[PDB]
């Protein structure tokens, strides 16, 4: 009869009212559910004490807050209103680099994870430049190349760079409509030897992340907080005992 819950959360996107495919939202650190109700009060005056005598609720709402520490592309799409984009690994052959280059300049490539970089001199007779004359910063992960020096007989300034770029996953920002996800919390109550507890939420409308600290200080992992309001599902039976906002299941 005591609660100290830990466990897993599953979400299923709702598109045009048809249930989607459920997925794990990865590690989650905190979940809380808050209930708010608005009431109109009726009073009676026969006693002369001017005190409350009746109250009937009018408003009914619920909100859910979730703190997830996963920066996976699927969770990013869920929270950033984005859609995942998959780019396959490929090669570049004739990319043109900026002109008027000199030692100390930093050039950037349109793709990341560059490898086998080759820069061909612009001339009637191609002449690849010496590797010693350029360097790759951050092991070519940022697509940045630094010039270490140029030969005394300055070659043709425009350059043609060819290399290989690895596959990557991209997420847009505000590129997707307000997701509607059904949440299934499956937690274990340690206070009762690990008793099973299940919480069901039929329809939840999420709110984009409030903050995201890219550069973190201290020993605390970056946290993503998302707030959402549990909407009223109109498909479940009205007289059905299961309700229309959520549910709790306890085995006993």
């Amino acid at each position: 009869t005591y609660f100290y819950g830990q466990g897993e959360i599953d979400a299923a996107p709702i598109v045009n009212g048809v249930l989607g495919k459920w997925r794990w939202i990865q590690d989650v650190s905190a979940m809380s559910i808050q209930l708010a109700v608005e009431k109109v009060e009726h009073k009676e005056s026969y006693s002369g004490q001017k005190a409350l005598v009746r109250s009937f609720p009018i408003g009914k709402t619920a909100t859910v807050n979730i703190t997830l520490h996963s920066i996976g592309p699927d969770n990013l799409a869920l929270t950033l209103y984005g859609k995942v984009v998959a780019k396959a690994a490929g090669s570049v052959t004739g990319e043109v680099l900026p002109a008027d280059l000199v030692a100390g300049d930093v050039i950037r490539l349109a793709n990341f994870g560059v490898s086998e970089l080759v820069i061909t001199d612009s001339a009637s007779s191609p002449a690849p430049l010496d590797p010693q004359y350029y360097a790759l910063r951050a092991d070519g992960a940022y697509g940045e190349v630094q010039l270490l020096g140029l030969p005394t007989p300055a070659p043709t300034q425009p350059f043609k760079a060819a290399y290989e770029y690895a596959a990557t996953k991209q997420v847009g920002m505000f590129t997707a409509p307000q997701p509607t996800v059904a949440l299934r919390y499956k937690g274990i109550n340690l206070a009762e030897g690990g008793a099973p507890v299940i919480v069901e939420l039929y329809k939840v409308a999420t709110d984009p992340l409030q903050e995201l600290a890219l550069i973190s200080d201290g020993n605390t992992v970056a946290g993503m907080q998302i707030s959402g309001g549990i909407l009223l599902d109109t498909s479940k039976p009205d007289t059905g005992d299961l309700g229309r906002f959520g549910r709790i299941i306890q085995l006993g």
Partner: protein, 189 residues
């Protein structure tokens, strides 16, 4: 709630032409206006207020409405038989010398006994003191230390017929209302 007092006059006929205006005192008299508020705190008080409202019959029936200011303060004790009340000079003689709207006095002693008097004529005595007169006697010897206020009286009647009795709790409870009284020339003159 802070209340207000105003001196409404029949000051019409300003005759504002093109060069400059000019105002003529048709009567040269000022009728003061006083606001009033009260709290019931009981059935008897509310019944008494309702009876008073019914007796008023709007603006028809008049009744004196004493102010609650401290316009006059004594500066010298006065014998019981004396009728030469001394008060500090407030320009009363220059402005008030017996004419309706002024006059009428309520001593309101410390103990609680209140004497109603009638001013007859005010004479200037000094730049700081006067010798305003009364109608007849005072009742006893009262020193300046034993006077609370004077609170000039004035006959008045209601200014607005409509009266709002704001019931809050119950008949045996608290009610709020506001009343306004305006001076009127009545009482056989």
């Amino acid at each position: 709630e802070d209340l207000t007092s105003s001196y409404q006059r029949l000051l019409s006929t300003l005759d504002n032409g093109s060069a400059i205006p000019r105002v003529t005192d048709v009567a040269g008299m000022a009728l003061p206006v006083i606001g009033h508020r009260w709290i019931g705190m009981g059935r008897a008080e509310r019944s008494a207020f309702r009876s008073l409202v019914y007796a008023l019959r709007g603006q028809q029936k008049p009744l004196w409405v004493p102010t609650h200011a401290d316009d006059l303060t004594l500066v010298a004790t006065v014998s019981q038989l004396s009728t030469a009340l001394d008060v500090r000079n407030i320009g009363y003689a220059r402005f008030a010398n017996g004419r309706p709207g002024r006059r009428d006095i309520r001593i309101e002693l410390y103990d609680g006994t209140v004497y109603h008097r009638r001013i007859l004529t005010s004479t200037e005595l000094d730049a700081d003191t006067e010798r305003v007169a009364i109608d007849a006697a005072l009742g006893r010897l009262v020193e300046p230390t034993d006077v609370a206020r004077i609170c000039f009286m004035a006959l008045c009647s209601a200014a607005s017929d409509v009266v709002e009795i704001e019931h809050v709790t119950d008949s045996e409870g608290v009610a709020t209302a506001a009343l306004t009284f305006k001076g009127v020339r009545d009482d056989e003159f």
